PDB file of N, CA, C and O in Angstrom:
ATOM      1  N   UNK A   1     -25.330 -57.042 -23.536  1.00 15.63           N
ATOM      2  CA  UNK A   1     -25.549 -57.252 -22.076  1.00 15.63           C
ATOM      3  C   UNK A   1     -24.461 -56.621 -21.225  1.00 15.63           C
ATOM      4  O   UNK A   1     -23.311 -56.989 -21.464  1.00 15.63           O
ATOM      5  N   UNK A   2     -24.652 -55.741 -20.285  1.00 15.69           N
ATOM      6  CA  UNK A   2     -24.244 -55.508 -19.460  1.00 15.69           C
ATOM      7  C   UNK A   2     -24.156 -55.476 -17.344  1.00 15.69           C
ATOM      8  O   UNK A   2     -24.817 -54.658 -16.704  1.00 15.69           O
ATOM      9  N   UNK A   3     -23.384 -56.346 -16.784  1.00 16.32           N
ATOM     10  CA  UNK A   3     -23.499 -55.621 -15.762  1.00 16.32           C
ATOM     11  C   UNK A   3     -22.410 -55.421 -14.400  1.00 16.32           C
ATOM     12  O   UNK A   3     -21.770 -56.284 -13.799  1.00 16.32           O
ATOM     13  N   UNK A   4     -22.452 -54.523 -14.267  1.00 19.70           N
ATOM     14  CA  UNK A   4     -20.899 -54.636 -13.532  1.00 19.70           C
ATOM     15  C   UNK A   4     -21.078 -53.172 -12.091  1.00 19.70           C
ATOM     16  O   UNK A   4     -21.189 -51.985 -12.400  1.00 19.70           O
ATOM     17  N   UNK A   5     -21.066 -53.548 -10.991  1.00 19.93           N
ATOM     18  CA  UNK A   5     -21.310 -52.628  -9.767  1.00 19.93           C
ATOM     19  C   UNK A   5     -19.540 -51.526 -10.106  1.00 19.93           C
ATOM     20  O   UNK A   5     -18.329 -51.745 -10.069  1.00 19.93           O
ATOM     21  N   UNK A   6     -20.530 -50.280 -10.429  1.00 18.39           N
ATOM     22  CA  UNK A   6     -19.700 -49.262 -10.939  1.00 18.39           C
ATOM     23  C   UNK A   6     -20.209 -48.151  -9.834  1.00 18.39           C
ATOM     24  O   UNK A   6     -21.433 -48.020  -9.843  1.00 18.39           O
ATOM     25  N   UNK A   7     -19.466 -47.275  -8.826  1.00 20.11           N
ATOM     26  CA  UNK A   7     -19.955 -46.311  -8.005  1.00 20.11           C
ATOM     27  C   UNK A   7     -19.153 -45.407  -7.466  1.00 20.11           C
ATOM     28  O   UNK A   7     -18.558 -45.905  -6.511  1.00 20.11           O
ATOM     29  N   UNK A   8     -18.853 -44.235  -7.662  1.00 16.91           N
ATOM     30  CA  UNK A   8     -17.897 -43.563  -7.118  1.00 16.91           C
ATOM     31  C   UNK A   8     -18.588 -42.268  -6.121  1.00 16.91           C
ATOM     32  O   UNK A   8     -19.789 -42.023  -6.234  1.00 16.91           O
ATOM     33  N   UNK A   9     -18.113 -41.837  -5.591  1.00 14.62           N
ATOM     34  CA  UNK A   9     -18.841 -40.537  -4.926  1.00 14.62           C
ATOM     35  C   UNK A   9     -17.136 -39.608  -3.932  1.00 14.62           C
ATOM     36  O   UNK A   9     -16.170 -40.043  -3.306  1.00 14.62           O
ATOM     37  N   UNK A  10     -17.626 -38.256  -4.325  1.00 14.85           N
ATOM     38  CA  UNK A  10     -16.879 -37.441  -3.651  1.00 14.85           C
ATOM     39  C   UNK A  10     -17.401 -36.523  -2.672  1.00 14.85           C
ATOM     40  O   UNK A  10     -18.463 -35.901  -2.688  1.00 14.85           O
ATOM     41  N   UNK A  11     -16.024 -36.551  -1.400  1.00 14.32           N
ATOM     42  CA  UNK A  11     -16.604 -35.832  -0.347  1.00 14.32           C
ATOM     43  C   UNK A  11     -15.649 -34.868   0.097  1.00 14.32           C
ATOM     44  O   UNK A  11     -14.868 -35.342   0.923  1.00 14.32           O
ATOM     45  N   UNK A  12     -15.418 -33.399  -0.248  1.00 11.97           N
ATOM     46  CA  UNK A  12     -14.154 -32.675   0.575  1.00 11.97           C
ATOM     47  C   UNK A  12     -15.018 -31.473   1.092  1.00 11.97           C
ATOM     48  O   UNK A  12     -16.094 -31.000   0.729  1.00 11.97           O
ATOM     49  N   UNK A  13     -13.913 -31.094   2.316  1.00 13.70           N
ATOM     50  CA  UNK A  13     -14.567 -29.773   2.765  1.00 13.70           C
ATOM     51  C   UNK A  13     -13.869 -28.574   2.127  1.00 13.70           C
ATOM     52  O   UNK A  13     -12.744 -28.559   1.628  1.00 13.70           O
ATOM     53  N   UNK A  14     -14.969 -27.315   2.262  1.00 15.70           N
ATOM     54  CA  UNK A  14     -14.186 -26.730   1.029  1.00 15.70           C
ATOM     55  C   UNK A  14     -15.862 -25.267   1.652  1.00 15.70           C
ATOM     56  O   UNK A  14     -17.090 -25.336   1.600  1.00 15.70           O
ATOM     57  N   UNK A  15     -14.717 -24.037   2.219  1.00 17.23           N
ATOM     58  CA  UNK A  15     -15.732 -22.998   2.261  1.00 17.23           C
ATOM     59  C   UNK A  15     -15.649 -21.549   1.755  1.00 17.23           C
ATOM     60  O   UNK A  15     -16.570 -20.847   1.336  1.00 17.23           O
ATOM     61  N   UNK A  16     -14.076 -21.194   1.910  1.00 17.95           N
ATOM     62  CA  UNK A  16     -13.779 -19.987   1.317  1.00 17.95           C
ATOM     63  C   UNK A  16     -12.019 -19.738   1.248  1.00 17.95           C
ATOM     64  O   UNK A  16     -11.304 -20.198   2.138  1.00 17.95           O
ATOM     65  N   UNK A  17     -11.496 -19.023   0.180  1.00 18.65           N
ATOM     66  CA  UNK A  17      -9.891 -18.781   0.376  1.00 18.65           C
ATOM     67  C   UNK A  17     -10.111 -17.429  -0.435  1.00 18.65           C
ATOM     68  O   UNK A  17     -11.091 -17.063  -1.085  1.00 18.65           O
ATOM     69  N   UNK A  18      -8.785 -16.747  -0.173  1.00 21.13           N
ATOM     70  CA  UNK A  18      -8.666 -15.247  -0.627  1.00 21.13           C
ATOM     71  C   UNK A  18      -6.921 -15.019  -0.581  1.00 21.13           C
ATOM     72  O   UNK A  18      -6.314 -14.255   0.170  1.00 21.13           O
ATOM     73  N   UNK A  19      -6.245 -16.089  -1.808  1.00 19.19           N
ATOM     74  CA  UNK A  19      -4.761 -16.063  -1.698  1.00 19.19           C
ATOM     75  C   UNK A  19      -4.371 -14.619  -2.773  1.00 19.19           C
ATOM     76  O   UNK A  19      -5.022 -14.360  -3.785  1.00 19.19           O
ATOM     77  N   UNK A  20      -3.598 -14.087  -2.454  1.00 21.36           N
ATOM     78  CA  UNK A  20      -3.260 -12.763  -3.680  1.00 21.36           C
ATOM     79  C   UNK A  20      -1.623 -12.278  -2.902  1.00 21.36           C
ATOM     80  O   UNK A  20      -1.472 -11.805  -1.776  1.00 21.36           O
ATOM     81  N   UNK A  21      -0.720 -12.537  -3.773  1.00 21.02           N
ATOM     82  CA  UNK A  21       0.551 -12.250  -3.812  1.00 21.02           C
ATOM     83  C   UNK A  21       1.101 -11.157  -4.965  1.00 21.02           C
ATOM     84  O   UNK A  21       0.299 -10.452  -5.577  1.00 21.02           O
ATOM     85  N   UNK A  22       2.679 -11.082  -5.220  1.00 17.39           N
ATOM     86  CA  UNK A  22       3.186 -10.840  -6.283  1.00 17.39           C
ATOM     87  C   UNK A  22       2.335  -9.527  -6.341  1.00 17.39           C
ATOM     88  O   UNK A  22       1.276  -9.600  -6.964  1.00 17.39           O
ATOM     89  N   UNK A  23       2.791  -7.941  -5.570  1.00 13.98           N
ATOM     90  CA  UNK A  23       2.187  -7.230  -5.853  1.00 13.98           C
ATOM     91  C   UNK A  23       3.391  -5.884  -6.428  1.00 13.98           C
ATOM     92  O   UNK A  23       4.153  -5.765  -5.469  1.00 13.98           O
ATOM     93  N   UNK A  24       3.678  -5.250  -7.131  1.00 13.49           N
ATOM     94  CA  UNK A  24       4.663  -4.594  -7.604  1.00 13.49           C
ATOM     95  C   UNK A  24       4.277  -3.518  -6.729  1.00 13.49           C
ATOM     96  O   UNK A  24       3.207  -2.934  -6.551  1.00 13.49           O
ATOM     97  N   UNK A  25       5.730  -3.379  -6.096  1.00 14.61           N
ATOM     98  CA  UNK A  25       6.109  -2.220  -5.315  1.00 14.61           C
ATOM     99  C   UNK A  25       6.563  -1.074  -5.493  1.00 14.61           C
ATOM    100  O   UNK A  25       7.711  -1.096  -5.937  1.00 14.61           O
ATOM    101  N   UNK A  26       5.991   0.280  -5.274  1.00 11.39           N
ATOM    102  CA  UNK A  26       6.516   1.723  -5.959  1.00 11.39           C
ATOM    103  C   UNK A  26       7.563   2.231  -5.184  1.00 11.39           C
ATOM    104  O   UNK A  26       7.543   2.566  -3.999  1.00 11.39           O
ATOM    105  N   UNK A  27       8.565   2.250  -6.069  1.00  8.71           N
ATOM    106  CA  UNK A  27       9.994   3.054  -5.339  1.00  8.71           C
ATOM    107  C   UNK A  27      10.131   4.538  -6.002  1.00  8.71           C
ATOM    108  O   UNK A  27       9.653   4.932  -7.066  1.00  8.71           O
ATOM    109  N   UNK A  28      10.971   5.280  -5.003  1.00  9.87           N
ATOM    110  CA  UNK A  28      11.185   6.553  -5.430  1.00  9.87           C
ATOM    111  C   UNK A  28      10.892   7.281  -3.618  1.00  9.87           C
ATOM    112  O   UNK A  28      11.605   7.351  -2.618  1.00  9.87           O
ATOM    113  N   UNK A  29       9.337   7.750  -3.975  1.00  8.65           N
ATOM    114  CA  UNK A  29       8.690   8.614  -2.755  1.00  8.65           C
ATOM    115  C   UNK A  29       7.511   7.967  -2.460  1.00  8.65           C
ATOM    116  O   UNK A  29       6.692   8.058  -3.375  1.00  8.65           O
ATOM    117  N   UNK A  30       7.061   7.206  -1.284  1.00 11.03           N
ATOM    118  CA  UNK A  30       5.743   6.624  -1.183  1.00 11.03           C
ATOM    119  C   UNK A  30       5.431   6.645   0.034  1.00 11.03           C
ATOM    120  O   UNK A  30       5.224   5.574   0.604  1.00 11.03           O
ATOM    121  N   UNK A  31       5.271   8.410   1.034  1.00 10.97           N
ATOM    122  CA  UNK A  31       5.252   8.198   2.396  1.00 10.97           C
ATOM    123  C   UNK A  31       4.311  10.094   2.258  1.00 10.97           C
ATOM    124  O   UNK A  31       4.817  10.951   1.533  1.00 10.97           O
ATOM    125  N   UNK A  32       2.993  10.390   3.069  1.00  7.94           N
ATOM    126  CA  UNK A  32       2.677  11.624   3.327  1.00  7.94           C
ATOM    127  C   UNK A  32       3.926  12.495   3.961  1.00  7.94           C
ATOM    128  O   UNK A  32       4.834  12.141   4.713  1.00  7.94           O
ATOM    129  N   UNK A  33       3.610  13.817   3.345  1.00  5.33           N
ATOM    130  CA  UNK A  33       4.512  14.988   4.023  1.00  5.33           C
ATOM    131  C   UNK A  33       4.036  15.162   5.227  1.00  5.33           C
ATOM    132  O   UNK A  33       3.232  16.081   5.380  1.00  5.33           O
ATOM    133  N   UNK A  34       4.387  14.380   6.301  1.00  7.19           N
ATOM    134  CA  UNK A  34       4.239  14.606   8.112  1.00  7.19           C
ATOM    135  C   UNK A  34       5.142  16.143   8.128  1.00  7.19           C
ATOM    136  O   UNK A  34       4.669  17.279   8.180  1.00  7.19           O
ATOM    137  N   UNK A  35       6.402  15.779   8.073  1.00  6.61           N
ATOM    138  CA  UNK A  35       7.336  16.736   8.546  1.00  6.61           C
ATOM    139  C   UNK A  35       6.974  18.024   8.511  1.00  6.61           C
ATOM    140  O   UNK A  35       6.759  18.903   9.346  1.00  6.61           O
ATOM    141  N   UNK A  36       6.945  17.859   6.540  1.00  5.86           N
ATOM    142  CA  UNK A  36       6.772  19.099   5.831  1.00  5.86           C
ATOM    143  C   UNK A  36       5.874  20.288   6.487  1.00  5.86           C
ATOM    144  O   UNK A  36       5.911  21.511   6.353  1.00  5.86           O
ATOM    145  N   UNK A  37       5.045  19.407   7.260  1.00  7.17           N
ATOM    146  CA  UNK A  37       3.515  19.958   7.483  1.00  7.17           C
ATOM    147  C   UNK A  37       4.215  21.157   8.626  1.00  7.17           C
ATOM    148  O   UNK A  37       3.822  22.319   8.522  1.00  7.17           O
ATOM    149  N   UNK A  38       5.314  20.780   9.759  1.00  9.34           N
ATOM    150  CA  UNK A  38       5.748  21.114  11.333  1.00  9.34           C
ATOM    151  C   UNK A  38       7.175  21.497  10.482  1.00  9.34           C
ATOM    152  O   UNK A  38       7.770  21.724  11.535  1.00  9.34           O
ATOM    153  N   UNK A  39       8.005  21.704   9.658  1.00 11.16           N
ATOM    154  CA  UNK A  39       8.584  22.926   9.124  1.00 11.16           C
ATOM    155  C   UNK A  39       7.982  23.950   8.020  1.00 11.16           C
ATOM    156  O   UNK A  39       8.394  25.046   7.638  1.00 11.16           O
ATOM    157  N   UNK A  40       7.242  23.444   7.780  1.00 11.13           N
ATOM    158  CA  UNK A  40       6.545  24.639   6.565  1.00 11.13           C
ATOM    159  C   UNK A  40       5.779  25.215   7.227  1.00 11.13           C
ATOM    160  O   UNK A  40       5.765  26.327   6.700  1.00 11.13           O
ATOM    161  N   UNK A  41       4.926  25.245   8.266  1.00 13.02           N
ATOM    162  CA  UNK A  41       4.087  25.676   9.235  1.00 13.02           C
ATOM    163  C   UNK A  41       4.763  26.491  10.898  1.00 13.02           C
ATOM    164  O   UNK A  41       4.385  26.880  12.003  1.00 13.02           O
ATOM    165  N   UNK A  42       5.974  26.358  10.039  1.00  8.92           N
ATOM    166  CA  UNK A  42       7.098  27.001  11.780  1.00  8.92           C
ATOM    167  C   UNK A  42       7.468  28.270  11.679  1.00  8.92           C
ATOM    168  O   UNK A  42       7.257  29.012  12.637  1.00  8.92           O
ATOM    169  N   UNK A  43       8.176  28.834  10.336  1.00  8.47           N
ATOM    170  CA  UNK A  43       9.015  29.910   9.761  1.00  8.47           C
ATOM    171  C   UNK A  43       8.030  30.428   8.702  1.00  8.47           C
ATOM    172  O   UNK A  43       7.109  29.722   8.290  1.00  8.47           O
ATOM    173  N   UNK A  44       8.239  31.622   8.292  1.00 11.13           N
ATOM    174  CA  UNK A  44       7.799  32.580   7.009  1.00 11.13           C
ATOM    175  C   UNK A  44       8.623  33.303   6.035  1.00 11.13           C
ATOM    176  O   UNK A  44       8.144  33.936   5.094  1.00 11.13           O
ATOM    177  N   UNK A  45       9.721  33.207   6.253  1.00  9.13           N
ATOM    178  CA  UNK A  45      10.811  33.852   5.751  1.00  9.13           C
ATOM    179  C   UNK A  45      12.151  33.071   6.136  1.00  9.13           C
ATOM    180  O   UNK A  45      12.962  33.632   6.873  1.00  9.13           O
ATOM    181  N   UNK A  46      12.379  31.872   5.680  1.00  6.25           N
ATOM    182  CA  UNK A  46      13.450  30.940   5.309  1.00  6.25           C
ATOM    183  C   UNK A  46      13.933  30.984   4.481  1.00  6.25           C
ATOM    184  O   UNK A  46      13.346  30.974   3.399  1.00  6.25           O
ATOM    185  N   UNK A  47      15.288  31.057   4.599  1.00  4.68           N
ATOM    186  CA  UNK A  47      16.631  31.616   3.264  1.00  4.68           C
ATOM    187  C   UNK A  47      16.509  32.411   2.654  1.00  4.68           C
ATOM    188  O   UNK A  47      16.476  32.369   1.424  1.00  4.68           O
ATOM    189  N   UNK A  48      16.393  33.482   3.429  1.00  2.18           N
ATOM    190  CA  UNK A  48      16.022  34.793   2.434  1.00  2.18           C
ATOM    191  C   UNK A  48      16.990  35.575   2.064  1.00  2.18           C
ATOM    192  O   UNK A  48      17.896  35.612   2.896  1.00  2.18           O
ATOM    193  N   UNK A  49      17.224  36.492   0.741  1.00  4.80           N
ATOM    194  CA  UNK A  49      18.378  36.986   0.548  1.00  4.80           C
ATOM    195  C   UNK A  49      18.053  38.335   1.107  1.00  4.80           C
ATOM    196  O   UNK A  49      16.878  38.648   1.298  1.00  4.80           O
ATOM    197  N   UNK A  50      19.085  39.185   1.390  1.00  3.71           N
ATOM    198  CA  UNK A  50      19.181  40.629   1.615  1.00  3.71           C
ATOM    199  C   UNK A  50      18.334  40.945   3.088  1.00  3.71           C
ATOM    200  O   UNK A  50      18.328  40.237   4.096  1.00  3.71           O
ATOM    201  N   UNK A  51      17.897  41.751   2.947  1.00  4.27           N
ATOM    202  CA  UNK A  51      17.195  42.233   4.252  1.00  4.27           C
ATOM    203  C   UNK A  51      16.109  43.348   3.876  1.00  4.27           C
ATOM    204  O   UNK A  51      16.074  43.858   2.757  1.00  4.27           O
ATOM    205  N   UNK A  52      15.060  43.745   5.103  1.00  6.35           N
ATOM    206  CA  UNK A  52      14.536  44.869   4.741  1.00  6.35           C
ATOM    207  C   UNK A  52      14.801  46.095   4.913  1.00  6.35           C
ATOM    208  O   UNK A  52      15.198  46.505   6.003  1.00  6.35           O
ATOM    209  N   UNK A  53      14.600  46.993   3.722  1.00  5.05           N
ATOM    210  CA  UNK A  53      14.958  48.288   4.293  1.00  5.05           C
ATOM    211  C   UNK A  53      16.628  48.952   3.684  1.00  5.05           C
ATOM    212  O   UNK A  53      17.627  48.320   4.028  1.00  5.05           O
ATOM    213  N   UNK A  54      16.732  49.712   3.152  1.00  5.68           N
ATOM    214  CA  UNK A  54      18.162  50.008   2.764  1.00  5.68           C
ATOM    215  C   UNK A  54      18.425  51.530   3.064  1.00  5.68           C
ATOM    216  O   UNK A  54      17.494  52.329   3.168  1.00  5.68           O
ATOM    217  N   UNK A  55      20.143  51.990   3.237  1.00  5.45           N
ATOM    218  CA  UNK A  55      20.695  53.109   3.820  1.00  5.45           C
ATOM    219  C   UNK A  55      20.990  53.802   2.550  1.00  5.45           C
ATOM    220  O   UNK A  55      21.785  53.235   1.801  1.00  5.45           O
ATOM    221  N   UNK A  56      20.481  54.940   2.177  1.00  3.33           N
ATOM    222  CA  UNK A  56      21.108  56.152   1.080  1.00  3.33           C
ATOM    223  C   UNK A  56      19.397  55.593   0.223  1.00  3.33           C
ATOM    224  O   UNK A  56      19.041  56.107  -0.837  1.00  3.33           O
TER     225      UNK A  56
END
């Protein structure tokens, strides 16, 4: 024989999460060539040795 008022019930709110940490970071070089673009695109003949054209 049994009888004994046994009743539990659960109620939470609960709709969406999107937690994300701990992401390993790249060191060294991690940026587009801006610059590069407005000195490589300025000059055609940078550090050049000698000259054109020679005497004898």
């Amino acid at each position: 024989g049994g009888k004994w008022s046994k009743s539990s019930v659960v109620g939470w709110p609960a709709v969406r999460e999107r937690m994300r940490r701990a992401e390993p970071a790249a060191d060294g070089v991690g940026a587009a060539s801006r610059d590069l673009e407005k000195h490589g695109a300025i000059t055609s003949s940078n550090t050049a040795a000698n000259n054109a054209a020679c005497a004898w």
